[PDB]
Design an enzyme around this catalytic site. Structure first.
Site, PDB file in Angstrom:
ATOM      1  N   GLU A  35       6.989  15.627   9.715  1.00  0.00           N
ATOM      2  CA  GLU A  35       5.927  15.390  11.253  1.00  0.00           C
ATOM      3  C   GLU A  35       6.975  16.101  12.790  1.00  0.00           C
ATOM      4  O   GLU A  35       5.770  16.397  12.655  1.00  0.00           O
ATOM      5  CB  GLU A  35       5.843  13.594  10.772  1.00  0.00           C
ATOM      6  CG  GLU A  35       4.920  13.556   9.791  1.00  0.00           C
ATOM      7  CD  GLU A  35       3.161  13.191   9.737  1.00  0.00           C
ATOM      8  OE1 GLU A  35       2.990  13.890  10.697  1.00  0.00           O
ATOM      9  OE2 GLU A  35       2.918  13.124   8.908  1.00  0.00           O
ATOM     10  N   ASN A  46      -5.351  18.075  16.781  1.00  0.00           N
ATOM     11  CA  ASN A  46      -6.337  17.781  15.685  1.00  0.00           C
ATOM     12  C   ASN A  46      -7.393  18.742  15.714  1.00  0.00           C
ATOM     13  O   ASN A  46      -8.339  18.562  17.332  1.00  0.00           O
ATOM     14  CB  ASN A  46      -6.286  16.169  15.310  1.00  0.00           C
ATOM     15  CG  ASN A  46      -4.740  15.926  14.887  1.00  0.00           C
ATOM     16  OD1 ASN A  46      -4.118  15.388  15.270  1.00  0.00           O
ATOM     17  ND2 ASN A  46      -3.399  16.625  14.477  1.00  0.00           N
ATOM     18  N   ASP A  48     -10.258  17.675  15.310  1.00  0.00           N
ATOM     19  CA  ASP A  48     -11.342  16.502  16.126  1.00  0.00           C
ATOM     20  C   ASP A  48     -11.514  17.165  17.483  1.00  0.00           C
ATOM     21  O   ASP A  48     -12.188  16.033  18.389  1.00  0.00           O
ATOM     22  CB  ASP A  48     -11.211  15.565  15.713  1.00  0.00           C
ATOM     23  CG  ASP A  48     -10.258  15.096  15.183  1.00  0.00           C
ATOM     24  OD1 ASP A  48     -10.067  14.342  16.271  1.00  0.00           O
ATOM     25  OD2 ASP A  48      -9.715  15.155  14.172  1.00  0.00           O
ATOM     26  N   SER A  50      -8.170  15.605  19.046  1.00  0.00           N
ATOM     27  CA  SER A  50      -7.395  14.814  19.134  1.00  0.00           C
ATOM     28  C   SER A  50      -6.616  15.073  19.038  1.00  0.00           C
ATOM     29  O   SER A  50      -5.894  16.562  18.726  1.00  0.00           O
ATOM     30  CB  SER A  50      -7.774  13.063  17.840  1.00  0.00           C
ATOM     31  OG  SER A  50      -7.346  14.190  16.723  1.00  0.00           O
ATOM     32  N   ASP A  52      -1.448  14.044  17.939  1.00  0.00           N
ATOM     33  CA  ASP A  52      -0.051  13.553  17.226  1.00  0.00           C
ATOM     34  C   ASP A  52       0.489  13.918  17.806  1.00  0.00           C
ATOM     35  O   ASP A  52       0.701  13.982  18.171  1.00  0.00           O
ATOM     36  CB  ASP A  52      -0.298  14.261  16.068  1.00  0.00           C
ATOM     37  CG  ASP A  52      -1.838  14.604  14.687  1.00  0.00           C
ATOM     38  OD1 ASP A  52      -2.242  13.371  15.221  1.00  0.00           O
ATOM     39  OD2 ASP A  52      -1.463  15.882  14.748  1.00  0.00           O
ATOM     40  N   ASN A  59      -1.736   9.527  15.899  1.00  0.00           N
ATOM     41  CA  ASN A  59      -2.916   9.781  16.543  1.00  0.00           C
ATOM     42  C   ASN A  59      -3.453   9.688  17.734  1.00  0.00           C
ATOM     43  O   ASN A  59      -3.848   8.473  17.487  1.00  0.00           O
ATOM     44  CB  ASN A  59      -3.607  10.657  15.463  1.00  0.00           C
ATOM     45  CG  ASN A  59      -4.865  11.805  15.415  1.00  0.00           C
ATOM     46  OD1 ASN A  59      -5.206  12.039  16.442  1.00  0.00           O
ATOM     47  ND2 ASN A  59      -5.312  11.521  14.463  1.00  0.00           N
TER      48      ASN A  59
HETATM   49 CL   LIG Z   1      -0.960   8.771  12.064  1.00  0.00          CL
END
Ligand SMILES: [Cl-]
Length: 129
Positions: A35, A46, A48, A50, A52, A59
């Site tokens: 990750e 991301n 949309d 958002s 991370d 998120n």
């Molecule tokens: Cl997550």
């Protein structure tokens, strides 16, 4: 902060992630590796809008507030920046709430695609835990 593999394992265990919801420690270290590459300052945008955040790439759509994800949620009652701290306490605590929502660690796409099914034990091998 960029954690060592075993250092992260030690920190995660200390915060009680080992077998939390039945996920052995290796799963969490595996997920953190793919990750964030063990980097607490990791961020990723991301599609949309958002973002991370942190070592487990949590998120902002549901889990934290970053002030620029409109109509989102803050289920972990935290500013997303808190997830970037060298201290993983916030990320761990939030992870515990995520992995409890019913979909387990499948919530982390990197875990599902790269960790699930493999020998996750290999990720804490050689570590003094
Ligand atoms: Cl997550």
């Amino acid at each position: 902060k960029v954690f060592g593999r075993c250092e992260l394992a030690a920190a995660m265990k200390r915060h009680g992630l080992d077998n939390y919801r039945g996920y052995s420690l290796g799963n969490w270290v595996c997920a953190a590796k793919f990750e964030s590459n063990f980097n607490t300052q990791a961020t990723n945008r991301n599609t949309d809008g958002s973002t991370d955040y942190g070592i487990l790439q949590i998120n902002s759509r549901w889990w934290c507030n970053d002030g620029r994800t409109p109509g989102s949620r803050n289920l972990c009652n935290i500013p997303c920046s808190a997830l970037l701290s060298s201290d993983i306490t916030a990320s761990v605590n939030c992870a515990k709430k995520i992995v409890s929502d019913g979909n387990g660690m499948n919530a982390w796409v990197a875990w599902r695609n790269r960790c699930k099914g493999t020998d996750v034990q290999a990720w804490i091998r050689g570590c003094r835990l």
